[PDB]
């Protein structure tokens, strides 16, 4: 019927994916391999298309793939998977991919996901917070340029600050953190910014005499990034909720 012309059209579609800033086209051989005609109906082999989409997730999910990060003082390092991430919704994407392809028109799409942000751009762009646990230092990049840096004090060897791709999911003023050492603790703070799901975040360290060096080995926090009060205040003042925070 007029379906054969369609099958050829489809077979020649240029299906392009844009994932985490990466761009690529689905191989013609794959689409042709998925083509299907049964009971007068043109379609794609779901199983195979789903496998592809499954592979995409295995290959790009920032929920199971660490992020290569260009640090300020160490070149390119690896920041483990953190709380800021996304995961491709396999079935949803498979159905949307099938629909896109079967329509027989070239297209460029980013997969359906779930997480802090979508995959139609790099997970980490040019606005973020860099916490170099090695040089116990921290920078805040805004649109590519440094807007504020300072030494800080990570957690103590026993309760280390975890490395990972996190983000500021909340901003609080005059809050009191709680916890254990056994032995409950308080610690009131003027500015609080949680970055993970265990209690690790950024806040003024009113009681810390000095920051930087290897102070943490001696007087490390319980995991949060202790920051100089005046700096923390200026930081809290400009960091918008949703800002990625890389800790390595």
């Amino acid at each position: 019927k007029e379906q054969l012309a369609s099958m050829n059209a489809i077979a020649n579609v240029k299906a392009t994916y844009s994932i985490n800033g990466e761009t690529f086209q689905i191989p013609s051989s794959d689409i042709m391999s998925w083509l299907t005609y049964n009971d007068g109906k043109v379609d794609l082999d779901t199983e195979q298309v789903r496998q592809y989409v499954t592979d995409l997730g295995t290959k790009y999910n920032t929920s199971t793939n660490d992020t290569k990060f260009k640090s300020t003082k160490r070149g390119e390092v690896t920041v483990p998977v953190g709380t800021y991430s996304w995961t491709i919704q396999t079935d949803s994407e498979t159905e949307a991919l099938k629909k896109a392809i079967l329509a027989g028109q070239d297209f460029t799409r980013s997969p359906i996901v779930q997480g802090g942000t979508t995959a139609d751009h790099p997970l980490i762009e040019d606005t973020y917070i860099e916490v170099d646990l090695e040089n116990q230092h921290m920078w805040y990049y805004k649109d590519g340029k440094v807007a504020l840096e300072t030494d800080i004090v990570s957690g103590k060897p026993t309760t280390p600050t975890p490395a990972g791709v996190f983000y500021v999911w909340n901003k609080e003023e005059d809050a009191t953190l709680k916890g254990t050492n056994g032995t409950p603790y308080e610690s009131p703070v003027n500015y609080w910014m949680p970055i993970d799901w265990t209690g690790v975040g950024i806040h003024d360290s009113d009681w810390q005499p000095e920051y930087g060096g290897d102070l943490w080995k001696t007087r490390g926090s319980h995991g949060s990034i202790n920051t100089p009060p005046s700096v923390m205040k200026e930081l809290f003042g400009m960091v918008e909720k949703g800002t990625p925070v890389l800790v390595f």
Side-chain angles (χ1 to χ4, degrees), residues 1-185 187-209 211-248:
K1 196 184 191 300
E2 291 93 294
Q3 293 174 288
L4 294 164
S6 172
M7 289 179 67
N8 183 273
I10 295 174
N12 289 294
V13 90
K14 291 162 193 52
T16 309
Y17 262 118
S18 187
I19 304 171
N20 208 358
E22 305 288 328
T23 305
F24 64 77
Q25 175 178 171
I26 304 184
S28 295
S29 52
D30 279 316
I31 293 183
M32 293 189 267
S33 171
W34 306 334
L35 252 189
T36 252
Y37 188 95
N38 299 276
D39 289 310
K41 301 183 197 299
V42 184
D43 203 29
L44 300 187
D45 180 317
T46 298
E47 180 173 62
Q48 283 168 46
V49 175
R50 187 187 199 283
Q51 184 53 51
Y52 184 78
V53 171
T54 282
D55 290 340
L56 288 178
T58 300
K59 210 166 294 177
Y60 300 88
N61 287 337
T62 51
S63 56
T64 61
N65 285 120
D66 303 323
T67 300
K68 289 185 182 57
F69 179 64
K70 300 180 181 188
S71 68
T72 296
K73 299 298 182 183
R74 306 218 305 126
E76 185 169 69
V77 291
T78 292
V79 179
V81 165
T83 48
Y84 191 53
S85 69
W86 45 254
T87 309
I88 294 178
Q89 298 310 97
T90 311
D91 292 328
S92 292
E93 249 303 289
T94 304
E95 283 304 330
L97 216 203
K98 274 177 62 191
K99 189 181 179 180
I101 295 180
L102 292 173
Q105 274 173 47
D106 298 342
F107 66 77
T108 302
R109 71 179 288 94
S110 294
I112 291 167
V113 303
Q114 271 180 38
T117 186
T118 45
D120 64 316
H121 63 80
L123 179 62
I124 302 299
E125 284 159 317
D126 64 0
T127 292
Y128 55 84
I129 294 180
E130 182 180 338
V131 173
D132 192 322
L133 292 180
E134 198 169 300
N135 305 311
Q136 205 87 329
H137 196 78
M138 169 173 88
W139 300 255
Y140 165 55
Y141 284 78
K142 214 302 172 177
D143 296 314
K145 303 182 181 175
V146 174
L148 180 173
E149 63 184 291
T150 164
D151 294 326
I152 51 79
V153 194
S154 66
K156 54 181 171 290
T158 46
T159 64
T161 299
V165 183
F166 308 107
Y167 72 121
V168 175
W169 55 266
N170 196 20
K171 297 176 68 181
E172 255 196 72
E173 288 191 52
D174 302 301
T176 301
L177 320 184
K178 290 182 170 65
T180 302
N181 295 71
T183 295
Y185 74 72
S187 292
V189 183
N190 292 303
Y191 307 93
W192 174 227
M193 296 185 111
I195 66 182
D196 80 346
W197 312 141
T198 70
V200 180
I202 305 172
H203 66 71
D204 47 284
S205 203
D206 192 67
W207 61 99
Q208 288 291 33
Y211 303 63
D214 51 56
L215 287 294
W216 66 283
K217 304 182 179 187
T218 298
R219 42 162 160 288
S221 65
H222 292 74
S224 292
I225 281 60
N226 294 32
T227 313
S230 55
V231 194
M232 181 68 242
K233 175 170 181 291
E234 211 184 316
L235 180 65
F236 182 104
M238 44 188 195
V239 170
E240 196 153 293
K241 176 214 165 211
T243 300
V245 179
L246 300 91
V247 181
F248 48 101

